[PDB]
Design an enzyme around this catalytic site. Sequence first.
Site, PDB file in Angstrom:
ATOM      1  N   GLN A 172       0.823  -1.205   0.000  1.00  0.00           N
ATOM      2  CA  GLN A 172       0.000   0.000   0.000  1.00  0.00           C
ATOM      3  C   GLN A 172       0.861   1.260   0.000  1.00  0.00           C
ATOM      4  O   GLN A 172       0.703   2.151  -0.838  1.00  0.00           O
ATOM      5  CB  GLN A 172      -0.935   0.010   1.224  1.00  0.00           C
ATOM      6  N   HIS A 176       1.533   4.048  -3.357  1.00  0.00           N
ATOM      7  CA  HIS A 176       0.991   5.402  -3.287  1.00  0.00           C
ATOM      8  C   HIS A 176       1.929   6.534  -3.678  1.00  0.00           C
ATOM      9  O   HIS A 176       1.572   7.701  -3.500  1.00  0.00           O
ATOM     10  CB  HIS A 176       0.413   5.683  -1.895  1.00  0.00           C
ATOM     11  N   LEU A 353      -5.659  -2.320 -11.815  1.00  0.00           N
ATOM     12  CA  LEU A 353      -5.083  -3.643 -11.563  1.00  0.00           C
ATOM     13  C   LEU A 353      -4.437  -3.840 -10.205  1.00  0.00           C
ATOM     14  O   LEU A 353      -4.443  -4.940  -9.641  1.00  0.00           O
ATOM     15  CB  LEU A 353      -4.039  -3.915 -12.642  1.00  0.00           C
ATOM     16  N   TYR A 354      -3.856  -2.768  -9.691  1.00  0.00           N
ATOM     17  CA  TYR A 354      -3.153  -2.821  -8.423  1.00  0.00           C
ATOM     18  C   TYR A 354      -4.048  -2.625  -7.215  1.00  0.00           C
ATOM     19  O   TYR A 354      -3.554  -2.548  -6.093  1.00  0.00           O
ATOM     20  CB  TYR A 354      -2.033  -1.777  -8.425  1.00  0.00           C
ATOM     21  N   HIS A 357      -7.266  -4.596  -2.606  1.00  0.00           N
ATOM     22  CA  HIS A 357      -7.862  -4.373  -1.305  1.00  0.00           C
ATOM     23  C   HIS A 357      -8.163  -5.621  -0.485  1.00  0.00           C
ATOM     24  O   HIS A 357      -8.175  -5.569   0.755  1.00  0.00           O
ATOM     25  CB  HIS A 357      -9.091  -3.489  -1.466  1.00  0.00           C
ATOM     26  N   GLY A 495       0.319  -7.523 -14.940  1.00  0.00           N
ATOM     27  CA  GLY A 495       1.036  -6.780 -13.913  1.00  0.00           C
ATOM     28  C   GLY A 495       2.546  -6.652 -14.072  1.00  0.00           C
ATOM     29  O   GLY A 495       3.075  -5.542 -14.061  1.00  0.00           O
ATOM     30  N   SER A 499       4.732  -3.439 -14.074  1.00  0.00           N
ATOM     31  CA  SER A 499       5.565  -3.475 -12.903  1.00  0.00           C
ATOM     32  C   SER A 499       7.074  -3.391 -13.161  1.00  0.00           C
ATOM     33  O   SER A 499       7.777  -2.666 -12.469  1.00  0.00           O
ATOM     34  CB  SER A 499       5.207  -4.738 -12.119  1.00  0.00           C
TER      35      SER A 499
HETATM   36  C1  COH Z   1      -2.646  -2.603  -3.158  1.00  0.00           C
HETATM   37  C2  COH Z   1      -2.685  -1.328  -2.480  1.00  0.00           C
HETATM   38  C3  COH Z   1      -3.719  -0.840  -1.607  1.00  0.00           C
HETATM   39  C4  COH Z   1      -4.087  -1.237  -0.318  1.00  0.00           C
HETATM   40  C5  COH Z   1      -3.470  -2.388   0.556  1.00  0.00           C
HETATM   41  C6  COH Z   1      -5.201  -0.369   0.048  1.00  0.00           C
HETATM   42  C7  COH Z   1      -5.878  -0.410   1.280  1.00  0.00           C
HETATM   43  C8  COH Z   1      -6.948   0.366   1.738  1.00  0.00           C
HETATM   44  C9  COH Z   1      -7.599   0.252   3.068  1.00  0.00           C
HETATM   45  C10 COH Z   1      -7.255  -0.685   4.157  1.00  0.00           C
HETATM   46  C11 COH Z   1      -6.852  -0.315   5.430  1.00  0.00           C
HETATM   47  C12 COH Z   1      -8.591   1.184   3.097  1.00  0.00           C
HETATM   48  C13 COH Z   1      -9.564   1.500   4.214  1.00  0.00           C
HETATM   49  C14 COH Z   1      -8.524   1.849   1.788  1.00  0.00           C
HETATM   50  C15 COH Z   1      -9.363   2.857   1.410  1.00  0.00           C
HETATM   51  C16 COH Z   1      -9.357   3.506   0.241  1.00  0.00           C
HETATM   52  N1  COH Z   1      -8.475   3.228  -0.768  1.00  0.00           N
HETATM   53 CO1  COH Z   1      -6.959   1.849  -0.903  1.00  0.00          CO
HETATM   54  N2  COH Z   1      -5.483   0.492  -0.988  1.00  0.00           N
HETATM   55  C17 COH Z   1      -4.602   0.212  -1.946  1.00  0.00           C
HETATM   56  C18 COH Z   1      -4.580   0.905  -3.161  1.00  0.00           C
HETATM   57  C19 COH Z   1      -5.462   1.979  -3.538  1.00  0.00           C
HETATM   58  C20 COH Z   1      -5.442   2.758  -4.895  1.00  0.00           C
HETATM   59  C21 COH Z   1      -4.435   2.460  -6.005  1.00  0.00           C
HETATM   60  C22 COH Z   1      -6.471   3.652  -4.782  1.00  0.00           C
HETATM   61  C23 COH Z   1      -7.062   4.642  -5.857  1.00  0.00           C
HETATM   62  C24 COH Z   1      -6.649   6.135  -5.749  1.00  0.00           C
HETATM   63  C25 COH Z   1      -5.220   6.484  -6.075  1.00  0.00           C
HETATM   64  O1  COH Z   1      -4.360   6.475  -5.145  1.00  0.00           O
HETATM   65  O2  COH Z   1      -4.955   6.783  -7.254  1.00  0.00           O
HETATM   66  C26 COH Z   1      -7.067   3.464  -3.478  1.00  0.00           C
HETATM   67  C27 COH Z   1      -8.141   4.202  -3.017  1.00  0.00           C
HETATM   68  C28 COH Z   1      -8.825   4.153  -1.796  1.00  0.00           C
HETATM   69  C29 COH Z   1      -9.991   5.052  -1.385  1.00  0.00           C
HETATM   70  C30 COH Z   1     -10.706   6.236  -2.197  1.00  0.00           C
HETATM   71  C31 COH Z   1     -11.918   5.832  -3.083  1.00  0.00           C
HETATM   72  C32 COH Z   1     -11.609   4.823  -4.209  1.00  0.00           C
HETATM   73  O3  COH Z   1     -10.739   5.122  -5.092  1.00  0.00           O
HETATM   74  O4  COH Z   1     -12.265   3.750  -4.254  1.00  0.00           O
HETATM   75  C33 COH Z   1     -10.353   4.647  -0.061  1.00  0.00           C
HETATM   76  C34 COH Z   1     -11.446   5.196   0.864  1.00  0.00           C
HETATM   77  N3  COH Z   1      -6.429   2.410  -2.721  1.00  0.00           N
HETATM   78  N4  COH Z   1      -7.516   1.355   0.935  1.00  0.00           N
HETATM   79  C1  LIG Z   2       6.112   1.524 -11.321  1.00  0.00           C
HETATM   80  C2  LIG Z   2       6.885   1.122 -10.040  1.00  0.00           C
HETATM   81  C3  LIG Z   2       6.797  -0.377  -9.770  1.00  0.00           C
HETATM   82  C4  LIG Z   2       5.348  -0.812  -9.786  1.00  0.00           C
HETATM   83  C5  LIG Z   2       5.195  -2.286  -9.550  1.00  0.00           C
HETATM   84  C6  LIG Z   2       5.496  -2.886  -8.219  1.00  0.00           C
HETATM   85  C7  LIG Z   2       4.931  -4.092  -7.863  1.00  0.00           C
HETATM   86  C8  LIG Z   2       3.986  -4.827  -8.833  1.00  0.00           C
HETATM   87  C9  LIG Z   2       3.136  -5.946  -8.299  1.00  0.00           C
HETATM   88  C10 LIG Z   2       3.003  -7.146  -8.976  1.00  0.00           C
HETATM   89  C11 LIG Z   2       3.700  -7.414 -10.294  1.00  0.00           C
HETATM   90  C12 LIG Z   2       3.395  -8.692 -11.046  1.00  0.00           C
HETATM   91  C13 LIG Z   2       3.282  -9.842 -10.052  1.00  0.00           C
HETATM   92  C14 LIG Z   2       3.869 -11.121 -10.599  1.00  0.00           C
HETATM   93  C15 LIG Z   2       5.352 -10.961 -10.841  1.00  0.00           C
HETATM   94  C16 LIG Z   2       5.829 -11.934 -11.903  1.00  0.00           C
HETATM   95  C17 LIG Z   2       7.268 -11.651 -12.338  1.00  0.00           C
HETATM   96  C18 LIG Z   2       7.531 -12.101 -13.769  1.00  0.00           C
HETATM   97  O1  LIG Z   2       7.165 -13.251 -14.102  1.00  0.00           O
HETATM   98  O2  LIG Z   2       8.094 -11.305 -14.555  1.00  0.00           O
END
Ligand code: COH
Ligand SMILES: CCCCC/C=C\C/C=C\CCCCCCCC(=O)O
Lengths: 553, 553
Positions: A172, A176, A353-354, A357, A495, A499
């Site tokens: 996460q 960001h 894709l990333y 959640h 990805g 990635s």
């Molecule tokens: C894999 C990464 C990851 C994780 C673990 C995570 C974990 C969590 C989490 C757990 C504690 C909570 C409560 C939230 C809550 C939110 N996340 Co994320 N988020 C993550 C990647 C994102 C991304 C990417 C966005 C879209 C907005 C951006 O940053 O461009 C996001 C957006 C959000 C939003 C704004 C609305 C929306 O775009 O839907 C909320 C609220 N969240 N997130």
């Molecule tokens: C733009 C900054 C870096 C962003 C990416 C960071 C993490 C990406 C998360 C997952 C990537 C693909 C997951 C499987 C990896 C396979 C590797 C391969 O077989 O090649």
Amino acid sequence: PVNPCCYYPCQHQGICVRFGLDRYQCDCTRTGYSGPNCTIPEIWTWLRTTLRPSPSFIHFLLTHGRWLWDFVNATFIRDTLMRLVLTVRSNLIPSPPTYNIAHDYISWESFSNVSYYTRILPSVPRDCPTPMGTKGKKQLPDAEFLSRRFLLRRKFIPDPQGTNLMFAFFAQHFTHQFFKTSGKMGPGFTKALGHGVDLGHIYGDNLERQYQLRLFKDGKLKYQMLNGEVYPPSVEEAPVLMHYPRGIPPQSQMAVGQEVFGLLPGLMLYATIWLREHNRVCDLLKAEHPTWGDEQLFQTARLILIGETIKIVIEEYVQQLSGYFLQLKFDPELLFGAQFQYRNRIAMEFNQLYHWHPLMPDSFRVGPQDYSYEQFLFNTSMLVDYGVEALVDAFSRQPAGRIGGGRNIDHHILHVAVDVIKESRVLRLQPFNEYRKRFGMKPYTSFQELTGEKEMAAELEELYGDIDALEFYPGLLLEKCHPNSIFGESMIEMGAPFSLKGLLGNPICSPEYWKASTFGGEVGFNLVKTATLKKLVCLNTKTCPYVSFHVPD
Amino acid sequence: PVNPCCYYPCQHQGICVRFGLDRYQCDCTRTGYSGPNCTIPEIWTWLRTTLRPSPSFIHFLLTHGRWLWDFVNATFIRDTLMRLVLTVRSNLIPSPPTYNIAHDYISWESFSNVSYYTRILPSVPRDCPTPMGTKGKKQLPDAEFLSRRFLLRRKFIPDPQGTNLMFAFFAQHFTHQFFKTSGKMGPGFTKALGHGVDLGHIYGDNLERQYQLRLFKDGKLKYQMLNGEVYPPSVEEAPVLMHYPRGIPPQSQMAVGQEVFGLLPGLMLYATIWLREHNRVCDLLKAEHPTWGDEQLFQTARLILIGETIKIVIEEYVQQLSGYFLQLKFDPELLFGAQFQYRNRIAMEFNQLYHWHPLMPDSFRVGPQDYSYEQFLFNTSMLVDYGVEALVDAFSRQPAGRIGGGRNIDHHILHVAVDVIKESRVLRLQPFNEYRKRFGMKPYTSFQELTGEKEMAAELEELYGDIDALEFYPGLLLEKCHPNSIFGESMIEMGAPFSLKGLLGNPICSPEYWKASTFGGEVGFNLVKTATLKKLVCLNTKTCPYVSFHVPD
Ligand code: COH
Ligand SMILES: CCCCC/C=C\C/C=C\CCCCCCCC(=O)O
Ligand SMILES: *[C@@H]1O[C@H](CO)[C@@H](O[C@@H]2O[C@H](CO)[C@@H](O[C@@H]3O[C@H](CO[C@@H]4O[C@H](CO)[C@@H](O)[C@H](O[C@H]5O[C@H](CO)[C@@H](O)[C@H](O)[C@@H]5O)[C@@H]4O)[C@@H](O)[C@H](O)[C@@H]3O)[C@H](O)[C@H]2NC(C)=O)[C@H](O)[C@H]1NC(C)=O
Ligand SMILES: *[C@@H]1O[C@H](CO)[C@@H](O[C@@H]2O[C@H](CO)[C@@H](O[C@@H]3O[C@H](CO[C@@H]4O[C@H](CO)[C@@H](O)[C@H](O[C@H]5O[C@H](CO)[C@@H](O)[C@H](O)[C@@H]5O)[C@@H]4O)[C@@H](O)[C@H](O)[C@@H]3O)[C@H](O)[C@H]2NC(C)=O)[C@H](O)[C@H]1NC(C)=O
Ligand code: COH
Ligand SMILES: *[C@@H]1O[C@H](CO)[C@@H](O[C@@H]2O[C@H](CO)[C@@H](O)[C@H](O)[C@H]2NC(C)=O)[C@H](O)[C@H]1NC(C)=O
Ligand SMILES: *[C@@H]1O[C@H](CO)[C@@H](O[C@@H]2O[C@H](CO)[C@@H](O)[C@H](O)[C@H]2NC(C)=O)[C@H](O)[C@H]1NC(C)=O
Ligand SMILES: *[C@@H]1O[C@H](CO)[C@@H](O[C@H]2O[C@H](CO)[C@@H](O)[C@H](O)[C@H]2NC(C)=O)[C@H](O)[C@H]1NC(C)=O
Ligand SMILES: *[C@@H]1O[C@H](CO)[C@@H](O[C@H]2O[C@H](CO)[C@@H](O)[C@H](O)[C@H]2NC(C)=O)[C@H](O)[C@H]1NC(C)=O
Ligand SMILES: CCCCC/C=C\C/C=C\CCCCCCCC(=O)O
Ligand SMILES: CCCCCCCCO[C@@H]1O[C@H](CO)[C@@H](O)[C@H](O)[C@H]1O
Ligand SMILES: CCCCCCCCO[C@@H]1O[C@H](CO)[C@@H](O)[C@H](O)[C@H]1O
Ligand SMILES: CCCCCCCCO[C@@H]1O[C@H](CO)[C@@H](O)[C@H](O)[C@H]1O
Ligand SMILES: CCCCCCCCO[C@@H]1O[C@H](CO)[C@@H](O)[C@H](O)[C@H]1O
Ligand SMILES: OC[C@H]1O[C@@H](O)[C@H](O)[C@@H](O)[C@@H]1O
Ligand SMILES: OC[C@H]1O[C@@H](O)[C@H](O)[C@@H](O)[C@@H]1O
């Protein structure tokens, strides 16, 4: 007269272009094919496509030969694969970048306006019959429904691959720095320019904010001792924007670089860890270069984190994710013989894709305590109450959730999921199957095939009416996973390219930059060449807790 | 304790770095050498440097075999050289970019802050004995003096190479899209981001300004009929900034894209020519793509000028300059097999170097009339009074001045010259000889050697006391020219690299972009592939006057 490009007649990345009032033409240039729609394989492409094994097969070899791999691992055959892995995967991402939310064609604007996220596939023409183009119903499934019905977690399903929470947050946090959609400008835009691993989530994303965070002395960053341990500064010293809830904006209201990092201890934890590193680097640098200024001690130490990060993210982060016996490796030199553009531009599809959640648990275990989202979200002392050592130890032990398979996103955050589906439609991303192609895969011929089961499958068809109609985010999360994988085929195959193109396309990775002088000294270069999660922690703490991207035992 | 890097101990592009309080180290990484100062040639470098002929010699072959060349020209041996010419020349420019006015080291800031011009060589440490480092006098020659004494024109010396004024302006115009130093921010900064051939001197350098100029219809640009011929719009319609003198800001106060283009008819002339082209392109595009919007007709037509420009600038502009029998050629594909970064960043040294003010005549001949600077500068109707046809015909006939040799800058503008010398010192650019090295040449061992004569030579030494001390701009203009050349050795050997790295490093030149679909249609691609000065004119005028980069007869 129906916009022909609505059917996506061009194949293999051929550019669709309207001619006259009702015709079109494909630009099969350098696509390896020729013909009306790029359907006639050149002599070699034909060889290529006949000898090329299925992705399903490769994932197999990569995940089975536990003897042949230890062997390959101990020899050069390793870098050979790594180099192969790279080049091939990264070759799928256009660079210089192609289109954006505003242009479904190459334009100087698209090239230079770093604000626009970029897209791999053009968008679904605003004049096509169905919302996805040709097939489907004049109305997409109600995103609120789809969510609950297929993405909403029932019973928590942990990642068979052993992933833990120490990983979930790092993830996460890390993501960001390049994913920052500007609410003001709307979907398809980003505050995080730079588009990569610039750590503009530590040093902030603008010069001022950086300066507000910079302790302009010894290249170090501001901070504050609490309990005798080091932590970030509060706005009162680091007068910079944040998003802490209207309550106690003075103390415990820490400044970091990423506006939203106060909202969860997980994020803040890492924020602390890195900051404690940077300053740690400076201490090392300054001893090697007494005659050095502040601006330097700063920039140099920065790059040493842009390095350390890219290293750990590859030889540990992606390693866990992969499930490969092949031991991934970070060595910029492996591309010095290739044709590679050291430039990246985050895409909307990569963003979507990333959205992993579902990695999130039900509650949060910390030794014997067991905080619930209410106690956890926006909490503001857990971090200082508990401490890095302890908190890390606690995350490195609690399992994370399987990302794919469907139905495993906790309810609290299930709203995110719905939005993505809503956003996507605003963005007008082509259908799942369309992206399958673009990323070297075959389109699914049925939901029964998409999903390993029959229930969801049947019901989804009832909804989309045609597998093609199926969408991007949903398909990705509802696809059957490789056995014991954290997720399915489409995730890895879509990805990794985004990635890696991004990881290695970092300027510091270029021949020009990859010198020991860029990290001022050999000492710097080694910190980069030998970074570890275990070291990013235990070298910035009093004691050494359990830390890894996977649960022990 | 004297800052060791003050002596420039590192050779062959080795990075100098302070260690401890009084030591230093060279990072000879990938420099082809090893040793304390990168002075020990690796096995191949040695081969390379022993078999490598002198630049003086190459310039010779390239300028003599008028039979062998027609032969080489008619065969593939042409593209071979061209490809060779490119790759080798461009390999001398670091990319991703290195340092800027603020950092004498690699930094993330330097990388991303497009505002900073970039430098090839670090700067002269702010703590070195002499202003140039080690050798010279504690005070540099008075720039006002140096100017008049060596750069001030006595008798007008025309370019032996036959260059004309039609060229002189195209040059001025063309270069002002990437050279835009911000007075506000000061030397070492630029308004012209993009850093290349984006024509942000036609479409302006910001989205608004563009929009203020855009007639948001048929992708075309605003304009106004005067005498029945097409011209740019006045601020009253094109409400955008300019610099016309406080007098008649309503009519004849035309908007263009480059703030300062009202200040000389020459610039405005071209401005008109291009605009009349763009809209011309649109007319062609729109017929091929009726179903097209405005944003497209615009962007597409743009790229068709970013192409046409890069084509003419190469197969005609640099051709004239070169004096080569080898027929230079623009074909992006020649690099598709090489390792090339499609990215550029204008440098301060490139800027300085391009200050070819002596190209300017004494007066300006237009048929029988003969305007003097007073009548010419800031004039505001000559253009519409006379007309493009006529004015072009008039420039294509009046000789331009030799650029090198010394003493040939008209007095009116001789102030520019002084400023550059003053600026340079603010910038702290290393000595002429230092740049000679960095660009693969030997440092001069005396002014007598620098300058082909003995007078200036002797007096310059009296001034700098040591040839090393000699500066960048002065050295370049005071160097002896190749026989009959428009200028000397150092200009070509330092210019071409910056010049080509920039021309070909344009995104449109990449494999990704270089498709007929990027110029929507085959028609677009051909306009790019067959652009000419003669066509940039006579295809946007009623009659066909004499136009070329050199005088007739
Ligand atoms: C894999 C990464 C990851 C994780 C673990 C995570 C974990 C969590 C989490 C757990 C504690 C909570 C409560 C939230 C809550 C939110 N996340 Co994320 N988020 C993550 C990647 C994102 C991304 C990417 C966005 C879209 C907005 C951006 O940053 O461009 C996001 C957006 C959000 C939003 C704004 C609305 C929306 O775009 O839907 C909320 C609220 N969240 N997130
Ligand atoms: C733009 C900054 C870096 C962003 C990416 C960071 C993490 C990406 C998360 C997952 C990537 C693909 C997951 C499987 C990896 C396979 C590797 C391969 O077989 O090649
Ligand atoms: C990256 O790309 C995004 C765009 O996708 C950039 O942000 C957007 O920028 C645009 C333009 O700067 C901005 O414009 C919006 O459109 C409104 C329409 O404006 C009117 O219509 C035309 C357009 O110029 C004019 O003829 C009108 O007349 C005006 O003329 C006078 C001349 O001086 C004006 O002074 C007077 O106001 C008069 O009305 C009129 O301008 C515009 O008015 C409005 O402000 C609106 O903003 C977008 O809103 C921007 N925002 C976004 C996210 O879309 C972004 O800047 C780019 N990034 C970079 C760094 O280039
Ligand atoms: C490319 O790079 C150039 C810089 O080379 C960028 O332009 C320059 O940007 C800087 C910073 O944005 C700007 O700063 C100057 O320095 C003054 C010093 O500021 C004071 O000292 C420190 C620094 O932050 C603070 O501790 C001081 O206290 C302040 O803290 C409060 C917190 O909210 C403030 O609100 C309050 O004012 C208080 O005093 C104080 O800030 C700065 O104050 C002054 O404004 C000055 O501008 C340069 O002037 C900029 N201009 C140039 C050309 O150098 C450029 O932005 C970069 N480009 C991009 C797009 O990134
Ligand atoms: C080879 C191109 C070229 C030509 C033909 C040219 C022709 C002429 C000309 C003849 C009619 C006049 C009166 C001027 C006058 C000026 N030029 Co030029 N200039 C040229 C390239 C430049 C550059 C480059 C600059 C520096 C500022 C920038 O644009 O970054 C410049 C700057 C200037 C300045 C500002 C002060 C300074 O930097 O010294 C004045 C005044 N001029 N120039
Ligand atoms: C924020 O986190 C703190 C822990 O750092 C929470 O306080 C703990 O609450 C549990 C029960 O919920 C007690 O058994 C612990 O002893 C408490 N720790 C201490 C010493 O304070 C706090 O309740 C959380 N606040 C929110 C927002 O719910
Ligand atoms: C600006 O240029 C115009 C020409 O377009 C100048 O006017 C000419 O001046 C000459 C003598 O200087 C006359 O013989 C021509 O007949 C004039 N042309 C016409 C018909 O106007 C004008 O003097 C210049 N203005 C400035 C700023 O000096
Ligand atoms: C190229 O793509 C088009 C677009 O789908 C294909 O379809 C067109 O031609 C078909 C052949 O009879 C018809 O079935 C379709 O009605 C028609 N549709 C459109 C959008 O034009 C076309 O056949 C393809 N050609 C090849 C080589 O397969
Ligand atoms: C490398 O560069 C240094 C810097 O000039 C050379 O000079 C140093 O050593 C010389 C050898 O006796 C002395 O003449 C100088 O006083 C001394 N100066 C400095 C700045 O240290 C050094 O010799 C060079 N080494 C090589 C391999 O040529
Ligand atoms: C950045 C955009 C383009 C900027 C440059 C445009 C024009 C440059 C002017 C002169 C370049 C060098 C002159 C000699 C050419 C020699 C060609 C060669 O022997 O290789
Ligand atoms: C068996 C693995 C050999 C070394 C790596 C080969 C390239 C792996 O990488 C990827 O593999 C996928 C298959 O799963 C392909 O679809 C991708 O195009 C390819 O880049
Ligand atoms: C190493 C064993 C597996 C290698 C085969 C991987 C399949 C080839 O990969 C293909 O390469 C093309 C490059 O021309 C890309 O354009 C295609 O999109 C990509 O799928
Ligand atoms: C004789 C010309 C053969 C084809 C071009 C060879 C490379 C020309 O280009 C340049 O030539 C200069 C010599 O003048 C060298 O100093 C440069 O390093 C080289 O890039
Ligand atoms: C084609 C006939 C002339 C070719 C020889 C040109 C001299 C080689 O050119 C050299 O190439 C190096 C690349 O490793 C650069 O680093 C050097 O700075 C450059 O001078
Ligand atoms: O996943 C599809 C299958 O492809 C085959 O090539 C492999 O041998 C299997 O192990 C794999 O499960
Ligand atoms: O300029 C120096 C000289 O170098 C020699 O190699 C060439 O044969 C001469 O023609 C040239 O004039």
